[PDB]
């Protein structure tokens, strides 16, 4: 502690008094991973390896849930020309659970791939596929001219050419009403300046890069405020209580001590949040009990020391701690302050300010030489 | 004896002390509430930022978080210093009256 | 108020970025400890005559 | 107060307890009277 | 089949002051013993709710759906069971149908060519002592369908039974960027005419990726001796302050833009 | 201070993985840059060679 104070004050000589230093905190002993124990693999093949993809004006949405996903086998495949995620890291998709997953599949051209990203402007963006500006998820795109482009001309993919107004995000429109591009209204199958809303392209392999067909899939999952039912392939671990642990519930990580709580979470309620928007109660995904989480014991540490030119002996005050946990604060697990020999005992004195170790409590009273607090003061005397 | 009637019946008499306490509590409570704001980051909880974002892209949101929270503590410390100066003035007046 | 614990609670990746901001945390801690000592000085000045 | 304490916001106790302040008050009043 | 069963049958609509209704949990997260403020779609307090009462013969009109709708049902025997959402409902644009037709609840989006007077019909005590819904005269053409969902029937009655205390079925429907959110609650009351004066909170029930333009909607009846009432209010984007008690149940609310 | 030049040949589509902090079959297994890389990267097609 004297060396730590010398390091904090940036001086070799320390004047008599009390000095706060970097506080102690109990490093968690082990880690907890609690996931729902579903085992069935998600039907990713039916999405990525489907026979025919839906048209862009009728993009196909699949609700993927109640299954185990492994995004590593998806990422490591180089067949995908474009693979970018917004709001999440592809390497971290494995380690975090998903509330609900929507996979959108369609076919576009290379030059319009940029239109897939949220907030962009283009025919696809303006008329048949608009992403919200706050999109989170991933997008994957890869050319399919070897599977979807025909020499005789493929006309089975269409898009909406004009609209009365730009579509809302994630809106799908199927109406085939004629667009009245001219001022005069019209009816019938066709009319002058009366464009048919759907327009197709001639898929043919001779087209260069930028006009080749591209199969595109978008994952638009939302995270961490709902009963997540999609998780990575990593196995869970056993549950322990009354110890500071690195817990991880459904991708929500944290460090703290767990206890059997009594807060009635409704069936749609999985997490409870405090005033600081931090988690305080959690529902286990395997057992339906409710547990309170508390940040394990930490508090400020002060060093009481007379003048270094008088002595090198110090005492340390752990503030705000009924420190019968100091015997539990053994260096089998780790603590932020390395030194622990002062925990030897038989010189521990408990005060309303915490506990002071390294000083002997006496009955006879003297003037407050060095203030400790709560009426207790320290001094250096024979 | 009239003091006994004055203090026990009305409660606003000790208001000059109560506002000393409440403000501090409020000054603390707002400081806690500042941990709930995004400050431009995609998520308020730093654990969420660490979990969802890789060590390269996480840094830009995390830096926003430190910027906002450090500004919040700077404001709180400045307010505490001003309030402590006011309380020192009141305490010096009390010492003079004593 | 522990600056490191407040901004960068139980995270070392946050502390790595926080140490780039210099002695702001130390200044805040020093100011708060100064206020803490000032409180006892006020109390002793008022009552310990 | 627990939520405040959990993020590193500690309330330190006064050096002079309410009993010691009462003792100074009693001494001052006794001297005055 | 579908038959033009008479005209609109006069003008039913009345108006009522919804004292304290349209309260739901803004998010699926527990929170206790605090005062929490929220910015979202809600029902105004003391709002001018529209009241429809089924006193004979009658029709249920089509009403606009903009910005989500709060629905309430003062009812016995659970006559009201369905809803239609859309913009045109004549197969020109996509349209959605939710029906609890005895066996189960079906939620189905198709290019429905809805008939001008859709309804459901039942047969009472036909040699089985049971009541069977024989007629389903709601739509005529369903060319293309993108989403179909059947889970369970939702005739969720509560304690008391036999309709001794009138049942309030209170729901909130929203359609935000293709996510359709349905919040629901049921509660017994002992009041005869007006909307009961009291506080309650709505739990989130269903979220669907319907993704369809919806400007108007209609309700659905169970023609068999019985009357029922239903109320419609229009949600607005506003901020409200909620008092979460010790148990995390919304105990009281204040409208941040009422007075 | 000192200059160290690293030379190799890879498939073109994985050239992005040469950038620091990236991941993939190249970055994760045979060539990883540090997060704080300072320097330059040069790449060119060599199928003709």
Swiss-Prot record, chain A:
Region annotation (Integrin-binding motif) ranges: 109-111
Outcome of swapping residue 37 to Q: Reduced viral infectivity
Cysteines engaged in disulfide bonds, as pairs: 42-67, 85-138, 97-231, 186-194, 244-296, 323-355, 368-377
Consequence when changing residue 79 to P: In strain: Omicron/BA.1, Omicron/BA.2, Omicron/BA.2.12.1, Omicron/BA.2.75, Omicron/BA.4, Omicron/BA.5, Omicron/BQ.1.1, Omicron/XBB.1.5, Omicron/EG.5.1
Disordered: region residues: 25-41, 161-196, 225-247, 327-346
Binding partners and assembly: Binds to host ACE2. RBD also interacts with the N-linked glycan on 'Asn-90' of ACE2. Cleavage of S generates a polybasic C-terminal sequence on S1 that binds to host Neuropilin-1 (NRP1) and Neuropilin-2 (NRP2) receptors. Interacts with host integrin alpha-5/beta-1 (ITGA5:ITGB1) and with ACE2 in complex with integrin alpha-5/beta-1 (ITGA5:ITGB1). May interact via cytoplasmic c-terminus with M protein. May interact (via N-terminus) with host bilirubin and biliverdin, thereby preventing antibody binding to the SARS-CoV-2 spike NTD via an allosteric mechanism.
Outcome, altering residue 253 to K: In strain: Omicron/BA.1
Resulting phenotype, residue 189 to A: Increased resistance to neutralizing antibodies
Result when mutating residue 199 to Y: Reduced host ACE2-binding affinity in vitro
Glycan-linked positions: 29, 31, 37, 49, 309, 322, 363, 382
Entry function: Attaches the virion to the cell membrane by interacting with host receptor, initiating the infection. The major receptor is host ACE2. When S2/S2' has been cleaved, binding to the receptor triggers direct fusion at the cell membrane. When S2/S2' has not been cleaved, binding to the receptor results in internalization of the virus by endocytosis using host TFRC and GRM2 and leading to fusion of the virion membrane with the host endosomal membrane. Alternatively, may use NRP1/NRP2 and integrin as entry receptors.
Domain annotation BetaCoV S1-CTD: ranges: 40-233
UniProt-reported outcome of changing residue 123 to T: In strain: Gamma/P.1
Region (Receptor-binding motif): 143-214
Effect of residue 158 to R: In strain: Delta/B.1.617.2, Epsilon/B.1.427/B.1.429, Kappa/B.1.617.1, Lambda/C.37, 19B/501Y, Omicron/BA.4, Omicron/BA.5, Omicron/BQ.1.1; Contributes to cellular immunity evasion and increases infectivity
Name the record gives this protein: Spike protein S1
Effect in UniProt of substituting residue 190 to K: In strain: Beta/B.1.351, Eta/B.1.525, Theta/P.3, Iota/B.1.526, B.1.1.318, Gamma/P.1, Zeta/P.2 and Mu/B.1.621; May enhance affinity to human ACE2 receptor
UniProtKB/Swiss-Prot annotation, chain D:
Known role: Subunit of the fusion protein that is processed upon entry into the host cell. Mediates fusion of the virion and cellular membranes by functioning as a class I viral fusion protein. Contains a viral fusion peptide that is unmasked after S2 cleavage. This cleavage can occur at the cell membrane by host TMPRSS2 or during endocytosis by host CSTL. In either case, this triggers an extensive and irreversible conformational change that leads to fusion of the viral envelope with the cellular cytoplasmic membrane, releasing viral genomic RNA into the host cell cytoplasm.
UniProt-recorded name of the protein: Spike protein S2'
Species, as recorded: Severe acute respiratory syndrome coronavirus 2 (2019-nCoV)
Portion of the parent chain present: 850 to 882 of 1273
């Amino acid at each position: 502690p004297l060396s730590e104070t010398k390091c904090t004050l940036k001086s070799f000589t320390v004047e008599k008094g009390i000095y706060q230093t970097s506080n102690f905190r109990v490093q968690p002993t082990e880690s907890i991973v609690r996931f729902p124990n579903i085992t069935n693999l998600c039907p990713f093949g039916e999405v990525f390896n489907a026979t025919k993809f839906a048209s862009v004006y009728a993009w196909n949405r699949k609700r993927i849930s109640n299954c185990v996903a492994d995004y590593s086998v998806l990422y490591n495949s180089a067949s995908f020309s474009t693979f970018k995620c917004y709001g999440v890291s592809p390497t971290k998709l494995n380690d975090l659970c998903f509330t609900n997953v929507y996979a959108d599949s369609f076919v576009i051209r290379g030059d319009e791939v940029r239109q897939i990203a949220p907030g962009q402007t283009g025919k696809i963006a303006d008329y048949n596929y608009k992403l919200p500006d706050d999109f989170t998820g991933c997008v994957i795109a890869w050319n399919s001219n070897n599977l979807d482009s025909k020499v005789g001309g493929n006309y089975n993919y269409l898009y909406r050419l004009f609209r009365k107004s730009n579509l809302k995000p994630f809106e799908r429109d199927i109406s085939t009403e004629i667009y009245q591009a001219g001022s005069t209204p019209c009816n019938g199958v066709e009319g002058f300046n009366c464009y048919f809303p759907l327009q197709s392209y001639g898929f043919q392999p001779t087209y260069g890069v930028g006009y080749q067909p591209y199969r595109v899939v978008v994952l638009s999952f939302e995270l961490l405020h709902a009963p997540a039912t999609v998780c990575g392939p990593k196995k869970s671990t056993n549950l322990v209580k009354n110890k500071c642990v690195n817990f991880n519930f459904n991708g929500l990580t944290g460090t703290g001590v767990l206890t059997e709580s009594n807060k009635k979470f409704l069936p749609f309620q999985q997490f409870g949040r405090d005033i600081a928007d931090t988690t305080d109660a959690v529902r286990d995904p395997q057992t339906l009990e409710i547990l309170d989480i508390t940040p394990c014991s930490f508090g400020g540490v002060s060093v009481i020391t007379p003048g270094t030119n008088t002595s090198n002996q110090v005492a340390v005050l752990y503030q705000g701690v009924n420190c019968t946990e100091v015997p539990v604060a053994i260096h089998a697990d780790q603590l932020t302050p390395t030194w622990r020999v002062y925990s030897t005992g038989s010189n521990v004195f408990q005060t309303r300010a915490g506990c002071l170790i390294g000083a002997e409590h006496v009955n006879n009273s003297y003037e407050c030489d060095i203030p400790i607090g709560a009426g207790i003061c320290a001094s250096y005397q024979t | 004896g009239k003091i006994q009637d004055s203090l026990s019946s009305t409660a606003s008499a000790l208001g000059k002390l109560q506002n000393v306490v409440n403000q501090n509590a409020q000054a603390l409570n707002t400081l806690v509430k500042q941990l709930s704001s995004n400050f431009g980051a995609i998520s308020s909880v730093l654990n969420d930022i660490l979990s969802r974002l890789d060590k390269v892209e996480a840094e830009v949101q995390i830096d926003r978080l430190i910027t906002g929270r450090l500004q919040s503590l700077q404001t709180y410390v400045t307010q505490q210093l001003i309030r402590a100066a006011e309380i020192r003035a009141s305490a010096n007046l009390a010492a003079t009256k004593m | 108020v522990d600056c490191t614990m407040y901004i960068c609670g139980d995270s070392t990746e946050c502390s790595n970025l926080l140490l780039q901001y210099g002695s702001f945390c130390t200044q805040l801690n020093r100011a708060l400890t100064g206020i803490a000592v000032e409180q006892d000085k006020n109390t002793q000045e008022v009552f310990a005559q | 107060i627990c939520a405040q304490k959990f993020n590193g916001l500690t309330v330190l106790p006064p050096l002079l307890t309410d009993e010691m302040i009462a003792q100074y008050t009693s001494a001052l009043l006794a001297g005055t009277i | 089949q579908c038959v033009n069963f008479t005209t609109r049958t006069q003008l039913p609509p009345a108006y009522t002051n919804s004292f304290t209704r349209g309260v739901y949990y803004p998010d699926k997260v527990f929170r206790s013993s605090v005062l929490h403020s929220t910015q979202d779609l809600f029902l105004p307090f003391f709002s001018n709710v529209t009241w429809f009462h089924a006193i004979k013969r009658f029709d249920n009109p089509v009403l606009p759906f903009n910005d989500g709708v709060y629905f309430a049902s003062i009812e016995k025997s659970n006559i009201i069971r369905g809803w239609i959402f859309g913009t045109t409902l004549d197969s020109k644009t996509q349209s959605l149908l939710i029906v609890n037709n005895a066996t189960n609840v079906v939620i189905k989006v198709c290019e429905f060519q809805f008939c001008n007077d859709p309804f459901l019909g039942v047969s009472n005590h036909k040699n089985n002592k049971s009541w069977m819904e024989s007629e389903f005269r709601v739509y005529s053409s369903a060319n293309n369908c993108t989403f179909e969902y059947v889970s369970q029937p939702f005739l969720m009655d509560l304690e008391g039974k036999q309709g001794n205390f009138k049942n309030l079925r209170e729901f909130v429907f929203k359609n935000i960027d293709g996510y359709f959110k349905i919040y629901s609650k049921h509660t017994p009351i002992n009041l005869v005419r007006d909307l009961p004066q009291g506080f309650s909170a709505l739990e989130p029930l269903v979220d669907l990726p319907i993704g369809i333009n919806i400007t108007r909607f209609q309700t659905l009846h169970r023609s068999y001796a019985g009357a029922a009432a239903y109320y419609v209010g229009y949600l607005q984007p506003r901020t409200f302050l909620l008092k979460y008690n010790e148990n995390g149940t919304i105990t009281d609310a204040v409208d941040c833009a009422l007075d």
